[PDB]
Design a protein around this ligand. Structure first.
Ligand code: 6TB
Length: 127
């Protein structure tokens, strides 16, 4: 009946960097997934109130979405590429945990995840 606050995208006391891998995660990985025809459900936090899914944030205790990831990358919120990759994987996994296997939303996440894996396969060596 209420949404939780979204994940943070700024934290001044959290150490952060820009690395060439993090730049790749923004310029190649996020950009590729964001433009995809099936990106739209993943471009912002789940609005469980509008969807009338009061159980969503009972099941999903570590929400993540590409809106959040985009803002984190734009703010250079991360220390390393692994932290950002973890956020994408959390997003996909949440979708697979909550939804019925085979449902259209799962097919959408799978399409995005296939591209994600293809891009991080070519993550550049650091520096
Ligand atoms: C929650 C479980 C499951 C899931 O795992 N995810 C991730 C999921 C996410 N979103 C949606 N839906 C439909 C949305 C899609 C897009 C938007 C969107 O565009 N919002 C924009 C925000 C900014 N404004 C200016 C314009 C509108 C909104 C959404 O819902 C309110 N459905 C999802 N499903 C399922 C798929 C079908 C039944 C629920």
């Amino acid at each position: 009946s209420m949404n939780p606050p979204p994940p943070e995208t700024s934290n001044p006391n959290k150490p952060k960097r820009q690395t060439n891998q993090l730049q790749y995660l923004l310029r190649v990985v996020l950009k590729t997934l964001w433009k995809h025809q099936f990106a739209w459900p993943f471009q912002q936090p789940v609005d469980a109130v509008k969807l009338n899914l009061p159980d969503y944030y009972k099941i999903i205790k570590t929400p993540m979405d590409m809106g959040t990831i985009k803002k984190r990358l734009e703010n250079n919120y991360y220390w390393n590429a692994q932290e950002c990759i973890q956020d994408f994987n959390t997003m996909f996994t949440n979708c697979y945990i909550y939804n019925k296997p085979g449902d259209d939303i799962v097919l959408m996440a799978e399409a995005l995840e296939k591209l994600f894996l293809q891009k991080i396969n070519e993550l550049p060596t650091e520096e």
